[PDB]
Amino acid sequence: ELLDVIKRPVITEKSMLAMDEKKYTFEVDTRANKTLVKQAVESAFDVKVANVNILNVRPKFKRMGKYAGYTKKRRKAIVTLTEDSKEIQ
Amino acid sequence: AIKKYKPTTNGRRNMTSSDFAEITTSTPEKSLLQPLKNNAGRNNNGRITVRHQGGGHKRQYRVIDFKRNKDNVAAVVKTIEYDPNRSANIALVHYEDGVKAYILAPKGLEVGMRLVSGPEADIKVGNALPLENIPVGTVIHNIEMKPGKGGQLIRSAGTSAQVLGKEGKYVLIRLNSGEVRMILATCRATIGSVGNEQHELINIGKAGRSRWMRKRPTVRGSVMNPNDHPHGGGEGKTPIGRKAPVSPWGQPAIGYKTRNKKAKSDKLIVRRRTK
Amino acid sequence: MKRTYQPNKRKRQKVHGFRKRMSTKNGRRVLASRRRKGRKVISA
RNA sequence: GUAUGAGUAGCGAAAGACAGGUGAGAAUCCUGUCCACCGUAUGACUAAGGUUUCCUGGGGAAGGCUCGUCCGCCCAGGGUUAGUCGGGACCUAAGCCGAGGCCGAUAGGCGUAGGCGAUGGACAACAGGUUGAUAUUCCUGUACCAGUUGUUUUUGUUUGAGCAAUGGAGGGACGCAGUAGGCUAAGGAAUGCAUGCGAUUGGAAGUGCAUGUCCAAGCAAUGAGUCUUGAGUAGAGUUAAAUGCUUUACUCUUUAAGGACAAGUUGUGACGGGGAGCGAAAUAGUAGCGAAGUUCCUGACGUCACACUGCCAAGAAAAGCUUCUAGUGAGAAAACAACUGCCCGUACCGUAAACCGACACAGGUAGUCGAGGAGAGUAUCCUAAGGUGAGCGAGCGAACUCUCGUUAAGGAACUCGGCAAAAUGACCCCGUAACUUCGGGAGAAGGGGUGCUGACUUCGGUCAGCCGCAGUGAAUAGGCCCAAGCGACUGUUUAUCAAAAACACAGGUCUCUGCAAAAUCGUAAGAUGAAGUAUAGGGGCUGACGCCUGCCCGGUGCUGGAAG
């Protein structure tokens, strides 16, 4: 179903520094392999392997109004390339 | 023989143990060993049934023939070993086919005897004969109860028997403890008394040697509080106040003959003497 | 000295778990007796 | 909800002082200097447990036993990257669930086959660099394991090419104690490079101060050493088979030969990165530049390695692996090149302010590393690498309470009682009783020597000289003897008032119990006893060892009896 693989790019202080070595930080939905993300990126941007790396995130608190609730789980994806770029973001 | 340690400490004043001058090797075989546990007297349910168990060394079985059902093939016996399970020793056996097993070792077996096991085999030590082909007056072990189980009667160290005589059915046999009964005419045996004679002649000495063997201390009766034993209570040392001194459940100790009064064996037993 | 409530993660879910309270006819009594109140945490 | 106690008790073991910062406001925050504490730990790394406490930028209403510009607190943003690490797609121990099944008012209890279950088995990667936080995870270089695509040299599926069993077998495969031998780490000492020469009397070298004195996996070569005898002939067996495995008889062979393992070394890796120290180009000790790589001494229970001798209390399984046949059966099998390799954890604290104790609590917490001078040592005193200065203070120097130091003369007069303190204590040397179970008592008692310099010396010490009240000059380190009850002894005991004359204990004695044994748990199936078999197993009493263990069977229990 591989357009529900990738959601968003991550725009942070390390993620902009990953841009210099052709590395890109996407958010992949839960229960997805490394191989789906390779196939989805090759489908959507015409670039290659040089393997993905995949994280996870434990949630937090926040408090607003005497209430106590978590946030979402996440899963980052730091995809490296060999030969093309993405001046898209 | 028997060692006597020279008295150096206090827990060595009275120690005795065997020389183990009868045992050749110190390695068993791989194919004849099976594991064990220490059940510590505990059931499926896991409660203490038989008291005073558990908390010693480690052991393994040595799988020992009691049947001897190969016949007309000579057996070579080479090495004598040690059991942690039995008071008596064992022996390796080389059948000529290339089949090994362990066999209980009577007195007088040397390294390199050959023991024959058929119903036509002769009368020496260590031969397997059914209880028809044996003359009156021999000394016999591994007497079988039922035909086909292998041995269940007299197995341990330095014990003996005799055949007092035959009938057409059954065979009369004097066991140990003086008594006589009737054992069938299709039961195997071995000619000769069992090996080690000296297991009445050993001081354990320490307490910790009696806890090397898998035991545990037995508290006296009259020291328990009156809810753990019926002898209990009483301020000071007390005599046995109750008539006929009692086990911790009932059933007086000195005197109750307690077979089943309608046992099947009662037709076959003569001179129930020393029990 | 040692006091009691020394926690683990294997023991507090292989004693007070869920898969040991859908394995009797008394764990089921416990679960059904807690759902009458409407308690949020049913078990561990 | 608010008083009284009362602005009282307490502020939870420890050493700070000054200058300069920032700020409305400073003993309590930042920086600098000196001083001080631990240093077998208050130093480093991880397993549990905690669950964002981690980092960056702000804030001072409540928390912090005071203050607070600060914080493990409040707000906002942001950080945990794996073919090789620990776990799964591998195996099994204790135990648990257990198709059928066997029992049982219902409920349900027990159990074969098959499974689940690490604290254990088996398994392919090393060194450095990098950020505000991640690193056998990112990049730098060099490897390894299992595959897939094109090339590489051989055809009946007979095997003469392969593969090859859920079967035949080998192997994995194991205790405790004790010293002996070999390597490496770590350690120490000097005459190998680097800079600079004292402002307090003196010192250019040497007989001088401060500082640094190296390197991987993997691949090639070898090897201090360690273990083990090998060969043939004739038959039995391995449910059919086997060249595999086992085994019986006969002939040789033996410090020989064959085989198996092996810490470690030398090259390469490596023109690489590391380093005492120099030091900008803005506002950084930043970027960038690096000199030496020696010899002797001590040297590991870390490694070979459970290798070796000895002893009895006789010391886990299954898989991975290796062969032989059964079989299946176009023609795969070396080299080269290019690609593929899934899921979960990874921040942080981790002898603690972040775990267990309601607390930022004088308590508890498994494993590894754990330096120097004396020294047997992880003891004790002072220190290296490192980390702390304790989260209320300033004065004054009364009673009284606690913790310490000293005392004239007398030395148990105190007191239920020498309770508490005082005295002995290290190494070497002389000497040592009654009594005894011949091992002991025994460190019995009682005495003597110790520092520094020179000479002699084989070794070991001797001789001479010098000083002090005192020479193991500090800290650590048995008070002894004479009699008597009790218990033989080391052990165990009322967590939280009783540690003994109590219990256990080796030994003794009586009794029951012939195997579907007595006895016990259960309603029964079932199980323990026990895969044991009267030299064994249960029950009552006495408690090493030496000498002994008198009299009564009328009464009560037990056992035997047959007539009434």
UniProtKB/TrEMBL annotation, chain A:
SUPFAM superfamilies: Ribosomal proteins S24e, L23 and L15e (SSF54189). The keyword Chloroplast does not apply. Keywords: Ribonucleoprotein, Ribosomal protein, RNA-binding, rRNA-binding. The keyword Glycosyltransferase does not apply. InterPro entries: Nucleotide-bd_a/b_plait_sf, Ribosomal_uL23-like, Ribosomal_uL23/eL15/eS24_sf, Ribosomal_uL23_CS. GO terms for molecular function: rRNA binding; structural constituent of ribosome. GO terms for cellular component: ribonucleoprotein complex; ribosome. Pfam families: Ribosomal_L23 (PF00276). GO terms for biological process: translation. Part of the 50S ribosomal subunit. Contacts protein L29, and trigger factor when it is bound to the ribosome. Belongs to the universal ribosomal protein uL23 family. One of the early assembly proteins it binds 23S rRNA. One of the proteins that surrounds the polypeptide exit tunnel on the outside of the ribosome. Forms the main docking site for trigger factor binding to the ribosome. This is Large ribosomal subunit protein uL23. It comes from Enterococcus faecalis (Streptococcus faecalis). The gene is rplW.
Automatic annotation (TrEMBL), chain B:
It comes from the Bacteria. InterPro entries: NA-bd_OB-fold, Rib_uL2_dom2, Ribosomal_uL2, Ribosomal_uL2_bac/org-type, Ribosomal_uL2_C, Ribosomal_uL2_CS, Ribosomal_uL2_dom3, Ribosomal_uL2_RNA-bd_dom. GO terms for molecular function: rRNA binding; structural constituent of ribosome; transferase activity. Residues 36-47 have a biased composition (Polar residues). Transmembrane segments: none annotated. Residues 33-54, 220-275 are annotated as: Disordered. One of the primary rRNA binding proteins. Required for association of the 30S and 50S subunits to form the 70S ribosome, for tRNA binding and peptide bond formation. It has been suggested to have peptidyltransferase activity; this is somewhat controversial. Makes several contacts with the 16S rRNA in the 70S ribosome. HAMAP family: Ribosomal_uL2_B. Part of the 50S ribosomal subunit. Forms a bridge to the 30S subunit in the 70S ribosome. NCBIfam families: rplB_bact. This is Large ribosomal subunit protein uL2. It comes from Enterococcus faecalis.
UniProtKB/TrEMBL annotation, chain C:
One of its GO terms (biological process) is translation. Coiled coil: none annotated. Residues 1-44 are annotated as: Disordered. GO terms for molecular function: structural constituent of ribosome. Keywords: Ribonucleoprotein, Ribosomal protein. GO terms for cellular component: ribonucleoprotein complex; ribosome. The keyword Iron does not apply. InterPro entries: Ribosomal_bL34, Ribosomal_bL34_CS. Gene3D superfamilies: 1.10.287.3980. The keyword Ribonucleoprotein applies. It holds the Pfam family Ribosomal_L34. PROSITE patterns: RIBOSOMAL_L34. NCBIfam families: rpmH_bact. Belongs to the bacterial ribosomal protein bL34 family. This is Large ribosomal subunit protein bL34. It comes from Enterococcus faecalis (Streptococcus faecalis).
